[PDB]
Amino acid sequence: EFPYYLRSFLVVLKTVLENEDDMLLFDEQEKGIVTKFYQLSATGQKLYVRLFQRKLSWIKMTKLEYEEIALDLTPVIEELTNAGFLQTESELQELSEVLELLSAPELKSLAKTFHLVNPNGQKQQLVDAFLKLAKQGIGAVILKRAKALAGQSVRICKGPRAVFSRILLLFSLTDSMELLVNLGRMEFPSYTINRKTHIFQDRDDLIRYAAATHMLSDISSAMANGNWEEAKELAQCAKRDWNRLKNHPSLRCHEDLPLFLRCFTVGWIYTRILSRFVEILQRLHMYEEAVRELESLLSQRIYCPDSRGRWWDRLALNLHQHLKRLEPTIKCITEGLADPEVRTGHRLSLYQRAVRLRESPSCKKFKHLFQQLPEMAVQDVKHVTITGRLCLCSVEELALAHYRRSGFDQGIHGEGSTFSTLYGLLLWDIIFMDGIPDVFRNACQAFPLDLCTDSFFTSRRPALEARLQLIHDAPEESLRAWVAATWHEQEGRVASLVSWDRFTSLQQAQDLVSCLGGPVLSGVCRHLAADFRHCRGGLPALVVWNSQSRHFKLVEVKGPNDRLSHKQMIWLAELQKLGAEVEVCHVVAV
Amino acid sequence: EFPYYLRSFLVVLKTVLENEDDMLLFDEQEKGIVTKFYQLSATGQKLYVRLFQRKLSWIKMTKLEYEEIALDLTPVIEELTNAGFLQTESELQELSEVLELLSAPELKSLAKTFHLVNPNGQKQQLVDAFLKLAKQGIGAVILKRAKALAGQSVRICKGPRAVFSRILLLFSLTDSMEDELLVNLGRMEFPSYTINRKTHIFQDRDDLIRYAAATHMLSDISSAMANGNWEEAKELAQCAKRDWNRLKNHPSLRCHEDLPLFLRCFTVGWIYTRILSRFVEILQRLHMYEEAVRELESLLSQRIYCPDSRGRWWDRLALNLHQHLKRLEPTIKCITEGLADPEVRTGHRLSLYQRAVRLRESPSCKKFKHLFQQLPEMAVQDVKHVTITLCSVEELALAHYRRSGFDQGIHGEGSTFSTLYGLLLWDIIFMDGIPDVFRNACQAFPLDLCTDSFFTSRRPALEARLQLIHDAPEESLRAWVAATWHEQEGRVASLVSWDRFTSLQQAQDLVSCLGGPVLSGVCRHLAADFRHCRGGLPALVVWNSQSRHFKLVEVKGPNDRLSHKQMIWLAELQKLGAEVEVCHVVAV
DNA sequence: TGCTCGCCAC
DNA sequence: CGTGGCGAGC
DNA sequence: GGCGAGCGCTCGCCACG
C-alpha cells in the first residue's frame, strides 16, 4: 500500500526541504517544480519515482507494468506529461535517441527494410550507418519508421530529473564519489545529527558539482569497457570545463573547508577525475603527457592529499621506466620523501626505487644527489610454502585449510575488515561521539564524515587517548566485555567499519580479542585512528588461531605472481614490532 | 412548424409500417401503440420524439422547455400519460432511478436531510452512499424525499419505447453498430433503384428482439470504452459473452447461417461476434494478453460471421504472442494460417507477412525454418518520403503544396476517391436487378457494398465500365462526371461527399489530371475490395490546374505513422504511375 | 496529434 | 527584502 | 447547442532568511 521506494523518496524530500540553506541552492522555478511534484496524485508520484530510478532515456510504454499502481498507465503518463514531468514520443526528435531504444533483431529488421548494407553489423555500426545514411531529408523517414517499430514511448524530462538528482546528491554526498534500495530495511548506527556548515555556495555550485559527477561517471563507464580513446577525449573536455571553472567564487569557500568535507565539493571531484586521467594516459602509452598532468596535480595542495603517495610513486615509475629520465626521477623521490602526507606504504615504495636508481651504471655520476636519503629499512618476516590447486579455489581458503591442519582451528579472512571490525567494536562510542561539529549530517550515515581524515584523531584526541590506554592495559575479561557491550547493544546497525558477519558469533570475537591481547589491539587502533586510509589497506589477509592455547599467527597469503606490496610490508613489520606473530604464506602452482 | 426531427421520425414509421412481414415482428398491443402515437396530438408527437431521443431516464417536468411544442406542456404530458406513453412520478418506485434524476445541489440537500456524512461529496459518491444506506426498508423514505425535490417527473414507458426502438432498427440497420433516422430525411433525395426483398432476416419476433438487445448492449459497451470506463466495459462484455453461449445452438441460428453475408450482418450471432471482437481490445487495454488470446482463438474457430474481420484477428493474435507472450512457434503457425486464410484482405495480409519476415530472420527463430516453407512471395513496393518543418497539419501541408505549384488541393482522405468512384460509377453501383441489395427507399448504399458479392453481382457491368474508363479521353471523364453530378446532386450516398469538391468544375479538372488509366485502377480496387480500398487512400490530393501535374500525399506529423493499408495503397497508386509522396511534418 | 474535456438532447 | 510555503477561485 | 458539473491551478499571506 505504501511501498518502500516511495517511503524512502519521501524521507529524502522532507529532510532537504526542511533545511533553508539547502533551499538557497535552488532558484524559484526550480523550487516550483518540487511544489508541482508534491501536487501530483499518489499514482503520479509512484510512476515518476519508478521512472526516475531508471536510466535517463526513453522506455517502451508496453513494457511499463506496475499493477499495484494502475492496470493501465496511460492516464497517469498523461497527468505527468501535462504537468511537464514526462514526455511521450512526440518529443522524440533525435534519431540516436530512438535508435538507442530498439533491440538488436528490431534494428536488424529496420536495416533490411531500408536496404542497409552489411545489416548483420553490430548495433553501434547499424546506428552509425543509419545516421550517416540520413546525411545523404531521409533522416525524418528513418525516424518515423523506427518509432513505428518502437511503439509508444516515454521519458522523464531532464530538467525536473536533474533537480531531484541534485537533491539526492545534497542528501548523501559520500555516495557521490563512492539510490540504495535497502534503505527501507537497513538499521543505521546511532548518533545525534549535528550540521553546522554550508557545503554548496549556490544553485550554480550544485549544478557544476552535478555535471562533474556525471562526467566522472561517463569516463569511468568508458574505461570499464576498454574504450580508452573515447575515455580520453571525454576526460580532456572535462579537464577543459574544470580550468574554465577554477575562477568561480564558490571554489574559494570550498578551499576553506576541512579535508573531510572538502571531498564533497566540485573541485575535489574534478581532481579525482584528473587522477583517473593519469591512468588513462598511461594505458594509451602517452607517458610524456601523463607526467606533466601528475606534476600539475602535485603542484597544488587543496585536493586529495590522501592521493599524493599514489601520485609521487606513479610519477617516479613513469620517469624511471617510461621516460628513462634519471635526474628528475631522483628529484621526484626526494620531494616525495619530503611530503608529510605520504604514508609509509608509498614512502617505502618511493625509497625502494631510490636505492634501485642509486645502484646502476645509469646513475653513478649523480651520486651527490642521493645524500639526503634516510636509512629507512624494514624488518624480515617468516615465510612458508604450500602447493596450489587449479589454475584456483581462493588462495586464502587454501591457506585457511592448511592452518586448520596445523592446529589453528579458528581462522578469519576479512583483510582489513577483520581489524577494522574489532576497532569498531572497541571504540564505537568514540567513533560516534557527540560534540564534534559537522561529522554527522543525516541519520543515514554509516560513518563520521571525518573518519578517513587526519582530523578524525585530532578532533577526538582526549577521548581516544583515554580509550587506547584503557585497552592497552585492559584485562582479558575487560576486553571480552567491552566487545560484548557494543555487540549486544548495536548488532545489525550499519557501520562501514564493522562487518557484522565477519565473526561467526560474539564468542569468536571475544576469543580473538583474548588471543590478540590489549597491547596489540591498542597498537592497531592507534594506527587506524591516526592514519585510517593508509592503515586499513596494508593489513594481513588472514588471522588464524588455536582456541585452546590462544597461539595465533597473522598471515599474508600470496599465490604465484603475488608479492608483498609496500603497504603490506610496512604493516607486517609494525605488527611484528608489537610482538604479534606474523607470517607470509605462499601457495605454489600445481 | 413541422420540424425536421418529426419529419424524419414520420419517414421511419412510414417505411417500416409499409412492410407487412416486418410488421409481423410486433404483437397487437405493440402495433396499437404506434396507432396511438399517430392518434397523439401534433404538440403530442413533438414532445414524444424530443423525449424519445433522450436517454431512457426520468426527467423533471419543470425542467422541460419546448416552446415550439406548447407554451404549457402539462396537458401534453397528461395526454401522453393517459395514452400509456409516459409514466409520471406515481410509478417512480426505484431508489436508484430517483437518485439518478437529481442534480448536485439537490443531492446535497437530500444528504443534509438524512444526516449523511459528507453532504459535500461528489454526486456519484452521494448517490452511492444513499443507495447503500437504503440497503438497511428505509428506501421508501429516501424515495419520497427525492421525489419532493425532483417535483413532477416523467419517464418514457419502456414497453412502447422498445417497440419504436425495434422499428427504428428495422428502418436503418447500419445505424445500429455505427457508434463503433437521420435528420435531413424530409429533405434528402435518395438514389434510384428497385425495392427488392428476397430473404427473411429474422426467424421470429423473439429473434428480432434478441438481435436488438444485442445491438444495444454493443452500443453500451462501446460507449463505456470510449470514456475510458474499461472496467465497466469488461463486465458488460462478460455478461454479453454469457448471453451468447447461453444461446448458441438455438434453432434460430440455423436460419441465420443460411442468409447471404450482406444480410447475415443483421443477425444475433454476428453482433455477439462483434462484441467478442471488442472484448479482445478491452482485454489488451487491461494488459490481459493471456485471456485475449483464447478469445481470439475462439472467434477464429467459427467461420460463419464477420469473415471481413479475420485479418484483424490473425494479426492481433500474432502480435500478442510475438510480443509480451513471446511464444515463437505457435506465432509462426498463426501467421501462416492467417496468410493461408482467403478471407484476409490485403492490408492485414501485408501486416501479417511483415511480421513473418521479422520472425523468420532473428537468431531466436532459426530452428523453425521448416514452418516457413509454404510462404508465398507477396511483397509490396517501398514508397518515397519527404519532410518539412499545430495550425493545420493538413492545412500546413496544403499551404506548402500551393507554394510548390499545386494551386488546387483536397484534404479528402478516402472520401475524395470514393466520391470520384461514386460520380463515375453511380448508375452501376445502384443498378436494378440485384436481389436483396435494395430493401427500402431510404438507403444510402447497396446492402452488399461491404461484401465479396458486390463485385461478383455486378461483374459484367463493372468489367465493361472499367475498360471504358481506362481508355477514356479527358473529355469523356469530365462529361460523365458532370452528367452524374447534375442528375444526382444532393442525393444521399454514403460514398459521395457533395461538398468534397468546391464545384463540378474542380471535379472535372481533377479527373482530367488523373486520366483514365489511374481512375480505372482506383475504381477497380474500390469495386473489388471497397472496404479495404476506401481506408488506405492518401490524406491529400494536390494539383496544378494548368499543367495537370498532381501528387497524392500522405501526411504524418509527430507520433503519426503509416498504417499497413496506407503503405499498400501508396504502392498501388505508384504502380498506376501516379506520383505519390509521404510528407512528414517535424516540430517547430 | 495536440490536448484542459465530459456528456445529452438537438 | 526577498523568498517561498500555501490556501480559495475557474 | 447547452451545460452541468468537476477540479486542477493563480493570487494573496506570512515567515524566514
From Swiss-Prot, chain A:
It is an enzyme of class 3 (hydrolase). Its main location: nucleus. It catalyses: Hydrolytically removes 5'-nucleotides successively from the 3'-hydroxy termini of 3'-hydroxy-terminated oligonucleotides. This is Fanconi-associated nuclease 1. It comes from Homo sapiens. It is found in: Nucleus. Keywords: Coiled coil, Disease variant, DNA damage, DNA repair, Endonuclease, Exonuclease, Hydrolase, Magnesium, Manganese, Metal-binding, Nuclease, Nucleus, Phosphoprotein, Ubl conjugation, Zinc, Zinc-finger. Residues 275-300 form a coiled coil. Ubiquitinated and degraded during mitotic exit by the APC/C-Cdh1 complex. It is linked to Interstitial nephritis, karyomegalic: A rare kidney disease characterized by chronic tubulointerstitial nephritis associated with massively enlarged tubular epithelial cell nuclei. The clinical picture is associated with recurrent upper respiratory tract infections in addition to chronic kidney disease beginning in the third decade of life. The gene is FAN1. GO terms for biological process: DNA repair; double-strand break repair via homologous recombination; interstrand cross-link repair; nucleotide-excision repair. Nuclease required for the repair of DNA interstrand cross-links (ICL) recruited at sites of DNA damage by monoubiquitinated FANCD2. Specifically involved in repair of ICL-induced DNA breaks by being required for efficient homologous recombination, probably in the resolution of homologous recombination intermediates. Not involved in DNA double-strand breaks resection. Acts as a 5'-3' exonuclease that anchors at a cut end of DNA and cleaves DNA successively at every third nucleotide, allowing to excise an ICL from one strand through flanking incisions. It comes from the Eukaryota. Binds 2 magnesium or manganese ions per subunit. Mn(2+) 2 binds at E415, A541. GO terms for cellular component: cilium; cytosol; intercellular bridge; nucleoplasm; nucleus. Its cofactor is Mn(2+); Mg(2+). Changing R310A: Strongly reduced affinity for sites that have a 5'-terminal phosphate anchor at a flap of 1 nucleotide. The UBZ4-type zinc finger specifically binds monoubiquitinated FANCD2. Mn(2+) 1 binds at A541, E556, V557. The chain holds residues 373 to 1009 of 1017 of the full protein.
